[PDB]
Amino acid sequence: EVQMYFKSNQKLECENKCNLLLKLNPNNDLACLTLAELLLQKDEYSQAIEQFKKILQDRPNNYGILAKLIDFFRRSFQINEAKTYIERAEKKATNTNDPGLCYCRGLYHKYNRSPKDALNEFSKAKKSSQYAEESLVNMIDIYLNPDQDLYYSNVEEGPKVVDEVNLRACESLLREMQIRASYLRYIVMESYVFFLGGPRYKGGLEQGLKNLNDILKTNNDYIPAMLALAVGKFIQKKSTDAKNLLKLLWKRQYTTEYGEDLERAWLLSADSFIAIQKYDSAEEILKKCLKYNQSCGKAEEYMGLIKEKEQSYVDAATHYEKAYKLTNEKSASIAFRLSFNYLKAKRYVDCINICKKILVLFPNYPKIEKDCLEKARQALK
Amino acid sequence: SWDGLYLGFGTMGGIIGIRNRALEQLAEIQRSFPIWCMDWTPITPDYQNSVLVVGVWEQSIAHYNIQGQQLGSDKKLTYDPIDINFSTQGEFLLVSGTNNKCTLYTREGGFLIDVATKNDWVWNNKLKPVIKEAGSVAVQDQLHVALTTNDGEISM
Amino acid sequence: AQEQEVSKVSAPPNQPTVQVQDINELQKFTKINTLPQTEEGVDLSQLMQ
Structure with a gap:
């Protein structure tokens, strides 16, 4: 009842x-x-x-x-x-x-x-x-x-493959949720497993595409279906169709039930905007994401990268610092970017602290001690 | 030096030089890290020998003799030292630097307490010398330290 | 010098390193014997809970 x-x-x-x-x-x-x-x-x-x-x-x-x-x-x-x-x-x-x-x-x-x-x-x-x-x-x-992070990064590669037993665990969870969870979520999640399964089958991606096409034929509203379709068309080197789907995703109003996926789609769309010179729409999407969320990791990193490229070092440094605080002292690339930004902004103490902590964490970075640490050390006095 | 005879200087290139009042190359030691803080151990009737205490930037504190031969201590540290000061009569050692903490040590190297944590680099910390009368009786438990930080605070 | 050597010889692990050998086994063991279960139509993933 x-x-x-x-x-x-x-x-x-x-x-x-x-x-x-x-x-x-x-x-x-x-x-x-x-x-x-x-x-x-x-x-x-x-x-x-x-x-x-x-x-x-x-x-x-x-x-x-x-x-x-x-x-x-x-x-x-x-x-x-x-x-x-x-x-x-x-x-x-x-x-x-x-x-x-x-x-x-x-x-x-x-x-x-x-x-x-x-x-x-x-x-x-x-x-x-x-x-x-x-x-x-x-x-x-x-x-x-x-x-x-975003499932498919247009910067390089985009798929992520780790060992083989992760896929086995995913398959076990799929066979559990096919009898426990719903059916549409099962289709979408099996499609994700097939897409991220790599060259293990060479046929999982196409059958997932057929299943998602049937789903959109039956129901064109279900957000995970179109999100999976866009991911797969990123995989299949499709350009026009992928941006068409992401655009038609954008027009839909915010639904309380499917917010997260929408955000993810926006992030993907934002990435499609950062791969080209069109930084204005990219920063618009990033500001919308930061309006609807305050704990996103990749969005603030992209914002800091854009600001650093636009030689606005204070705001870029602030965004990079907040992103580094979000992922607590584990990432290394954004740490190097923050150190470089601090060095270029004449803040040698903070740059030296960042270099010291990143060298303590990873001792296998010969690029960072001679590039910014030595320069700041000599520029102290 | 407290005897007024020797002089010690350090360079960011790793070279520490000990000279006399005539400024001649009495001793030269080459390192691989910048040199920031040095001091001379105060004269003491128990010890009556002066050595150079220098804090290198490779997380180490070193004791050097007059001839330049190291005493072999080479005590390691977690943080890079910045400033070094010896208390009167050579009883304590105030160490500051990274981690934004001002700590106290014995002349051997034993940790005793940490004075303060400012949340910024402490550029210079100093101890208050005391004057002892002939045969005076006093516990002299009180100690006074003055700290100067990077943001612009001079605290006591 | 003798203190450190004697302590290392005895070294009774009191609290800190009683059994600290934590390494992921949910994925390490699935390499050892889980493949025969997987190629066949057998679901025993509940039974290994």
């Missing part, structure tokens, strides 16, 4: 059925998810955070609102009070290994640049009827995209 009322798009009687479920089973997941969805419907951005925090204070677990708040805090680079909130919710969670709490912890750890514990928590939380599809999508995204 709750599913039917959610499909009928009427909040009152659906909320009544959710109240009946709460009176029946306090540990219901679908009712909490529907209540969170209706709360998002009534209030989105005006004061939704305040009421969500109030409801979290009122009810100890409140897993759906907790997950939405975790997503918001990821969007607002404020993960510290997010981890305080998950701790205070876990203190009175009765049982540690609840599916909702485990899923929230896995999502938090995935958003904190840590794939191992996030994968472990997602696998632990998969043992339930609900959250199975989202958790499986999260583990397979982690397996395929560890650094959370």
Whole structure:
């Protein structure tokens, strides 16, 4: 009945059925998810955070609102009070290994640049009827995209292939979610596996293309289908058709259900704009992405690169520094770019600190000590 | 030097030179890293010998004799030193540099405490000398340090 | 000089290195014996949980 009322798009009687479920089973997941969805419907951005925090204070677990708040805090680079909130919710969670709490912890750890514990928590939380599809999508995204970047980079190559057992794990997760998760997501995710499987079959990409074409024939709205099609046409050296699809992706208005994919598409579109001299549309797309998100990694790196190319060193240095803070002291290329920008801006102390830390981390970089470290060291006094 | 006889200078090219009051090449030592901070150990009735303490930029602190022969200490450090100061009577050693921390050490090299962390490079840190009367009695537990940083703070 | 040598000879690992040998096994073991499961139509991935 709750599913039917959610499909009928009427909040009152659906909320009544959710109240009946709460009176029946306090540990219901679908009712909490529907209540969170209706709360998002009534209030989105005006004061939704305040009421969500109030409801979290009122009810100890409140897993759906907790997950939405975790997503918001990821969007607002404020993960510290997010981890305080998950701790205070876990203190009175009765049982540690609840599916909702485990899923929230896995999502938090995935958003904190840590794939191992996030994968472990997602696998632990998969043992339930609900959250199975989202958790499986999260583990397979982690397996395929560890650094959370654009799938196909026009700068060089674009596909990423790691060992062989990652594909085996992806296949196991696919055969699990073909009986657990939905069908369209199964088609899209098998298409991703085929596209990123490389020359292992030489036929997975074409059958994925046929499946996606059939999907668009049946349903031309499903965002992951067109996103997979655009990725595949990037793979197949198509130029006009790929930009046509990305353009027709752009015209669609922002839907709350499929925001992330849209952002990703925008990023891909932005890359298509940065490969050519058209930097104005690229910076427009980047400013839109930074308006709709505050934790993107590649977008700010591209913005810093554009600003550095336009010899605006202060803003480029700021963007590169924020990007380096986002990926916590692990990347090396953007560290070298930041060091070069600091050297060119007469900030030798910060450049020397960056060079020292990058040399401590990776001792196999002979290019960086003689290029900027020595010059700054001699220019100190 | 505290005896008023010797003089020590360092170069960013790694050359440390020890001369006399006549400015002659008494001793020359060549290194591979820039030279920033040097000092002379204060005279002491227990030790009565003066050595040159120089902090190199390869995360090391070195003790050199008058003839130029190293004493072999070559104590390693986590951070590159910037400034070095010996307390009166040669009891303490105030070390600053990278990590934005001002630390205290014994003359042997034992860590005791860290004075302050400013969150920026400390260019110059100095100790307050004390004057001891003939046969005076005092604990002299109090110590005073003055720090100067890169942003423009002179703290006490 | 003798202290370091004797300590290295004995070196009772108290807390820090009791069993610290953490290396990814979810992918290392799937190299060892998982291929025979994969070519055939057998799903035992639940059973290895």
